[PDB]
Amino acid sequence: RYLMDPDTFTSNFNNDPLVLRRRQTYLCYEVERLDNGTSVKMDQHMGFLCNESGRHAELRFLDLVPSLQLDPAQIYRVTWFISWSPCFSWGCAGEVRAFLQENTHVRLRIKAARIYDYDPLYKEALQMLRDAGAQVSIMTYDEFEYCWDTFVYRQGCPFQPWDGLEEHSQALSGRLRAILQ
Ligand code: NA
Ligand SMILES: [Zn+2]
């Protein structure tokens, strides 16, 4: 597993609104299989994706699902730690919705560092994901540190939080839950 540079992680998962980073998304993913109330963690199916040549990371994740060789007779939970919530206007929310409709064996958990409200239809993207069965939430300190510990070439350095991490997370979470109520 190639691990992400720490600078790339910190530049992209920051949730401070005064840090500009609209040009790029990073999407860390893991997959587990749900059997009789216990998960089979599948470490060979973890990684991260960014946007490439105009194709958003969310669509690039959909692009690689067949290579994960999921058994449709099984149930899987996919988790996304994504630096921006998925857009509507460039097709991500719609494609994820259609994917989850066609792939009823897949459950999707989305934890976003920030809300992508550069998209005029960002609220509709979030509601569309919720309506398609995705559980959508804002990243807290716990998830940022997990991501640092799991996806980052950190050489045993501990996660060090940026100023305001918890405050911004809680404000974002309030906005999100208001949108999804
Ligand atoms: Na595709
Ligand atoms: Zn998108």
- List the domain boundaries for the chain: 1-181
For 84, the token pair is: 């921006």
For 52, the token pair is: 């490439």
Of 32, 58, 95, 166, which one is the catalytic site residue?
58
Map tokens 């066609």 to a residue.
102
Q: What is the 3-state secondary structure of 34-92?
A: EECCEEEECHHHCEEEECECCECHHHHHHHHCHHHCCCCCCCEEEEEEEEECCCCCCCH
Map tokens 């097709």 to a residue.
91
The CA-based diameter of the chain, rounded to the nearest angstrom, is 46
Contact 171, 140 (CB under 8 A): no
- Cα–Cα distances (Å) from 126 to 78, 97, 102, 114, 180, in that order, read 17, 11, 19, 12, 7
Closest ligand relative to 99 C-alpha = 1
- What one-character DSSP code corresponds to residue 19? S
Beta strands 38-41; 26-35: pairing state = antiparallel
Resolution (A): 1.9
Amino acid at 1: R
Distance CA 45, CA 6 (A): 21
Q: Is 58 a catalytic residue?
A: yes
Amino acid at 158: P
HSE (CB half, 13 Å, CA atoms) of 72?
A: 5
Closest ligand relative to 24 C-alpha = 2
For 163, the token pair is: 């100023």
Distance CA 12, CA 9 (A): 5
